[PDB]
Amino acid sequence: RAHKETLDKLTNAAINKINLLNTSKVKYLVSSAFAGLYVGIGILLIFTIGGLLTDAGSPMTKIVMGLSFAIALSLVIMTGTELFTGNNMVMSAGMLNKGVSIKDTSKIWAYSWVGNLIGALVLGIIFVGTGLVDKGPVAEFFANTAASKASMPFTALFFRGILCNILVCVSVLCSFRTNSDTAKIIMIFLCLFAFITSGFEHSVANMTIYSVSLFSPTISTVTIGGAIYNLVAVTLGNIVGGALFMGLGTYILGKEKLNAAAENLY
Amino acid sequence: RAHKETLDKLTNAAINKINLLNTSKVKYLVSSAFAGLYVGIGILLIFTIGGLLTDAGSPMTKIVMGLSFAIALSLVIMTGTELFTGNNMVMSAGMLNKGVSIKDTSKIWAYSWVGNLIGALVLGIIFVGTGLVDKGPVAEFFANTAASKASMPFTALFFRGILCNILVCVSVLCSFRTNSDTAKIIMIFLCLFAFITSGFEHSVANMTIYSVSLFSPTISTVTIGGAIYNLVAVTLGNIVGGALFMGLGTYILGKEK
Amino acid sequence: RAHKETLDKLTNAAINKINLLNTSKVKYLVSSAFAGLYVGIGILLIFTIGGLLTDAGSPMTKIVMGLSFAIALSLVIMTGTELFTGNNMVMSAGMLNKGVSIKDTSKIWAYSWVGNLIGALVLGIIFVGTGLVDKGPVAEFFANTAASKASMPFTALFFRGILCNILVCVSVLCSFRTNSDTAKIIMIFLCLFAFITSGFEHSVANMTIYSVSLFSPTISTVTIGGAIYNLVAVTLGNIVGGALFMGLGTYILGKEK
Amino acid sequence: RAHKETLDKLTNAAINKINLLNTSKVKYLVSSAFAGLYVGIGILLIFTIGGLLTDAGSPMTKIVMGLSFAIALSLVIMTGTELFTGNNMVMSAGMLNKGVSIKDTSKIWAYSWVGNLIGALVLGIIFVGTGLVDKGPVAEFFANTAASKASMPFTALFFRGILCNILVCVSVLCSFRTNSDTAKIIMIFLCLFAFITSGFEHSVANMTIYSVSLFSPTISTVTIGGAIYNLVAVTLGNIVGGALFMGLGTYILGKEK
Amino acid sequence: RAHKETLDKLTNAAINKINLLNTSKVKYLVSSAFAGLYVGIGILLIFTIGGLLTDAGSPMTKIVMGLSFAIALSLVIMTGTELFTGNNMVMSAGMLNKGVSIKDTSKIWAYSWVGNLIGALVLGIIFVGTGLVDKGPVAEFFANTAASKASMPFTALFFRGILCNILVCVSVLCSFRTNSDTAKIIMIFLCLFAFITSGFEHSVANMTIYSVSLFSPTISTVTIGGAIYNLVAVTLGNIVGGALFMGLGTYILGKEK
Ligand SMILES: CCCCCCCCO[C@@H]1O[C@H](CO)[C@@H](O)[C@H](O)[C@H]1O
Ligand SMILES: CCCCCCCCO[C@@H]1O[C@H](CO)[C@@H](O)[C@H](O)[C@H]1O
Ligand SMILES: CCCCCCCCO[C@@H]1O[C@H](CO)[C@@H](O)[C@H](O)[C@H]1O
Ligand SMILES: CCCCCCCCO[C@@H]1O[C@H](CO)[C@@H](O)[C@H](O)[C@H]1O
Ligand SMILES: CCCCCCCCO[C@@H]1O[C@H](CO)[C@@H](O)[C@H](O)[C@H]1O
């Protein structure tokens, strides 16, 4: 346990993010574009597996998918690129610790979200171009899943988004709490396995699911209005999970009782 | 044989725990709540697996569940949060070695247990709101496991609680004996694999098994007395394993001539 | 972060490649022949798996193939040898950073591509002499995959090439951002799993698919023009993925404005 | 290479073991009882797996059991506790190297073996009390395995005991030759997978097999004479494996010329 | 790249090998006997797996065998012992680099191969003594594999030997290029997976195949003439793989010229 020094690290990470965005908007967006595409890469893989195993009628489908998703956030952490869902915790913590402002935060949130989206779009276009989604069980898996995510009640999506970002941000948190790159990756594998297989909802990952589906030639049963719906619900859920739970939580754990230079702890 | 070193570390962690509690009840409770929720997260995953593979008739169900539970304690150890079952060995070793009093130990136990339960209630509530336990195999898996755990005889729950916490605490003990975070996670993986697949009982994990089931409107036979009955029996077993075996054992190996 | 240091690292690597080729063509080409052979070894392993599981009607075939391909880039990275696809990002980043020139880049690309191919030819020849492709499902998996890769339309091949090298180059990128060799190998394993199972195309691996198919006794529809066609389409796609995305992207991330 | 430094370290461990026993019999026996229990925990896990998979008619049963046994020696090594079988190599090398006496070695063997059995006995008692061996495939697995282990000809048991302790002791030798805890656990995992799946015999793991089978009222296939018969023949082969092969061998590798 | 550094490490290792042999024949031979037996342990495990899964008609047999062979060379590398196949690259590179003579190289090859053989013979005898090859699918897997290896044409064996020792030697080369013991083991794992599942031939592993096959009364399918035929062809292939590819290749990469 050193929660204080962890709090200092999240604060420094928040500071550097806003400093970077102010410095170069292109640098910051390109960083966010990579991250969105890196996450999407995980989606292409596990949806391929979904199509493959669903068509075969395997009971192991959802387990294999979760076991296979680690690459999404592992690429993000190992490239040091900008992922919206992680910024929920980092910027929240930083702000409570007075390193960054509410404006600084909404800004990072806004642009990371947008750049991630750009990444998914580019990935979506390129993947469809491969013809792997022209016809088949994988194409169908994208179709069916895109539809289900858009057709499900806001409350359900909302809560799934909370639990997702608790898991995604806690893996990010572990990355702050260890110097071992291999331990980072392992904690990410565990958290992404738990979140994918348990059926929680990740906003950035969905950007690619719909990106691929709306760019896909075969029918739709998608209704881009649906994509927006899903994305709104999951995003707010994510924010709560990251900002309300992990951000505030790590702040509470690490803030020195002294200071006390504002507020007092029971 | 770093046994004296190890006991010095347990004792120091025990001291740090109670000082934290005395310094801040909110910080102690929040840390406890996180650890309760992180463990419950393991349960959500392995019960999803449980539902899926049970409904398939697979012989691999309990093996895959065991292999998949590592995240529970991995998250706890890697976040530095407060977990009741682990405090059983730490506070007992630290007390035997005169770093902390019995009152300190009793308090730390009461508070982490209550913190953990709070974490489980929040998780159980939020999980239910996802609608994932509304209906189907995962819902049924919660409903049936909760019931069999609440109706099992006391001596059996108790002895299962003993073996579980020997495994949970020995994995915490390993984390004190290595500087390698990967090796910590590996040993956690092994010990949680052994305890889940063998059929041992974890009090804090059960808190989520019960919060989910009770909070789920999809019908169940457990109730509160059922949940309380299991929790009491498993907690007592957990304490015996952690304190009487691991705490006393490590104190004996580590104590000064 | 450390994007600037990462760009410095790629620029330095890109500089050392051209300096090496300028000092010794033999060394450069020997290094390239090794890498081409190391990648092809991954192809032998997973096509053997392909032949085995396809024959069995397993739904797991492509998944097991992906999980088992890690050796291909792990060997290259752990031996420090010269792979054409990795050089798409390294040389493009170093070129934008003015460590090396465009001519340096096309020279390095030409030499590593050809040297890679020499390794593939050598490997295919020796593999055929083992008798392991004389007949049976492995021989058939080689014939069938070669045929389908060569008969696929250009656009599809090109885009699969793009996504393949994004993954391969981002694995190399990771190897520059960690001092942990285990972490390098793990990231390579994840990226190669993703690209093999997703259906993406790697020019250098395809060299072995084709040298094996064309050197072996078992009759196919492939021919030579087919191999060349596939290799042209996938190479261009690989170049776009490694150069336009990873090379340009890491340069933009690390460049002092 | 470091054969000399390795022998030095084995010698030192032999010296530290005898000193520990001389200083405190209790500390020594308690360490021994932990190790015997930790080994036994691996048996509880894999016999659970055995009952589940056998009951299912799985061809993978013995493979999954081997893969799942690593916890047994991993716990011992990571907690630094006293295991009879490892002491076959350590004491024999140490004695050969003039660090410890023949009588010292005899004493460490007797105490560690008996203390290990104390751990198995205690574990068997508690595990029976879980009700997990009451009736079903896990109880049948214990009962069937214990009977076949007690009815197997001496020669076959003895030789199985030799190969077993070459594997266990070589995994302890590896832990002496690396500073990476993660690599220690990997090597233990491999060697334990090899010995369980191949069919080799480990005296201390067997103590738990017989303690569970004998303490359980719903298991009557063996009795005590059957257990002694097996344990005597497996212990003798263990000794030969660890002392005559590993101990003598590493001494010959490391000794001053 | 650090190709010169690697060649220097290889050259130092060759020098150290020949000094060892010159210093003590007994030490050199004991070391070789260990490696031969450690490699054979891997054979005992994967042939138990082969017999189990072949008898069940599993498509996964050769895949699980390849995945399970890592112990063979992991033990050799972690105990620092003398393996003939590895010495093909090490002595070869150190010779080209003028650290050791052609005669030193012949000597080291001769002694390690014979020593490796002594370990295989001992392991064979003891394994037969376990009764584990008395009868059933494991004995039959041994009998059938020995026979197919004995009847295979020379060219096909030779080329299989080449590819096998590229893999074994590149895995040894990897261990000279990293300070991470976990990474060494991982690369060894991947290379042995590749060579076993693909169908490549390893001379020292084959020693234990024929050892068990010739010592078991219940295995009739082969003669000493067959074993010798296979061992000669496969050894020659191994030498070409280790010395002419890896040895010469690494010399070329690393030579200051
Ligand atoms: C909002 C939730 C707050 C939970 C705090 C629980 C307070 C318990 O407090 C402690 O309980 C122990 C026994 O149960 C006693 O032994 C201690 O003396 C006592 O301080
Ligand atoms: C409660 C546990 C008591 C354990 C006591 C074990 C002591 C055994 O005693 C030892 O036995 C050997 C042979 O039997 C002798 O050769 C040793 O000299 C002797 O010290
Ligand atoms: C060293 C091997 C393990 C020894 C275990 C001895 C426990 C015996 O104890 C008793 O004996 C009877 C038959 O054995 C059983 O029927 C009883 O249930 C059991 O309590
Ligand atoms: C158990 C006995 C094993 C002894 C093996 C010795 C075989 C030596 O063999 C020879 O050694 C010479 C130099 O020493 C080489 O020059 C020869 O090429 C080589 O054949
Ligand atoms: C089951 C297989 C998982 C293996 C994961 C290995 C991760 C180990 O961790 C790594 O190990 C190295 C030790 O050799 C260290 O040098 C590194 O610091 C460390 O990150």
Side-chain angles (χ1 to χ4, degrees), chain C residues 223-241:
Chain C
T223 225
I224 199 168
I228 281 171
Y229 164 81
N230 172 276
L231 288 169
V232 170
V234 178
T235 295
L236 292 178
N238 286 165
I239 295 171
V240 170

Side-chain angles (χ1 to χ4, degrees), chain C:
Chain C
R1 178 209 169 263
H3 293 139
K4 197 276 191 176
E5 186 184 19
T6 297
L7 182 54
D8 287 344
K9 277 155 155 145
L10 291 158
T11 304
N12 279 5
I15 291 185
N16 282 333
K17 291 171 179 285
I18 190 59
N19 287 342
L20 175 61
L21 174 62
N22 287 342
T23 295
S24 185
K25 311 223 174 319
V26 190
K27 284 181 178 208
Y28 192 84
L29 285 164
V30 163
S31 180
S32 294
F34 267 126
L37 180 140
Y38 292 154
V39 171
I41 278 170
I43 286 291
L44 307 186
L45 168 56
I46 69 164
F47 274 40
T48 294
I49 286 165
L52 287 172
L53 296 176
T54 291
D55 192 79
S58 166
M60 287 292 283
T61 297
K62 296 168 163 191
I63 304 165
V64 183
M65 286 175 68
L67 291 160
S68 307
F69 196 57
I71 189 169
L73 193 56
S74 306
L75 283 179
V76 168
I77 294 305
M78 294 302 277
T79 63
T81 46
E82 287 288 308
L83 184 57
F84 165 83
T85 48
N87 292 342
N88 297 153
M89 166 181 86
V90 176
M91 299 300 294
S92 69
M95 187 246 74
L96 295 151
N97 207 23
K98 311 188 183 315
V100 305
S101 74
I102 285 158
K103 278 141 171 267
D104 287 346
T105 299
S106 75
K107 209 154 200 155
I108 278 299
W109 287 358
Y111 275 86
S112 58
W113 197 93
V114 171
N116 288 165
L117 172 64
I118 289 162
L121 293 167
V122 167
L123 181 67
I125 282 160
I126 294 182
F127 184 64
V128 166
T130 70
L132 283 161
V133 293
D134 281 8
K135 72 172 301 98
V138 177
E140 296 179 21
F141 195 82
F142 270 99
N144 288 321
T145 311
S148 53
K149 288 189 179 293
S151 74
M152 176 152 301
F154 186 95
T155 299
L157 284 180
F158 177 72
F159 283 106
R160 296 182 195 202
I162 280 175
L163 294 179
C164 172
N165 209 20
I166 283 183
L167 271 158
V168 165
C169 278
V170 74
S171 101
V172 168
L173 182 56
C174 292
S175 99
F176 278 92
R177 299 181 52 87
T178 187
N179 299 322
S180 168
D181 296 330
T182 300
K184 296 171 196 176
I185 295 166
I186 289 169
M187 291 315 289
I188 286 161
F189 154 78
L190 298 176
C191 296
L192 267 56
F193 174 27
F195 109 64
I196 289 298
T197 306
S198 297
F200 310 154
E201 306 262 336
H202 190 247
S203 57
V204 177
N206 292 2
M207 290 170 180
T208 291
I209 296 169
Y210 292 110
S211 69
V212 168
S213 293
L214 293 158
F215 279 136
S216 93
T218 66
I219 292 64
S220 185
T221 76
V222 215
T223 225
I224 199 168
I228 281 171
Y229 164 81
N230 172 276
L231 288 169
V232 170
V234 178
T235 295
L236 292 178
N238 286 165
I239 295 171
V240 170
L244 201 76
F245 289 72
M246 298 313 297
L248 179 53
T250 61
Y251 168 79
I252 287 160
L253 288 176
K255 174 53 145 58
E256 289 279 40
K257 296 140 295 296

Side-chain angles (χ1 to χ4, degrees), chain E residues 21 25 29 102-112 114-115 118:
Chain E
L21 175 52
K25 258 114 249 162
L29 289 173
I102 294 161
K103 193 170 315 80
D104 297 332
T105 294
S106 330
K107 222 166 166 179
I108 287 297
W109 287 356
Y111 277 81
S112 58
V114 168
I118 296 175

Side-chain angles (χ1 to χ4, degrees), chain B residues 45-63:
Chain B
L45 168 63
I46 73 164
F47 274 39
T48 299
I49 283 161
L52 289 162
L53 296 190
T54 292
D55 193 50
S58 155
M60 293 288 292
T61 298
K62 294 177 176 174
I63 296 167

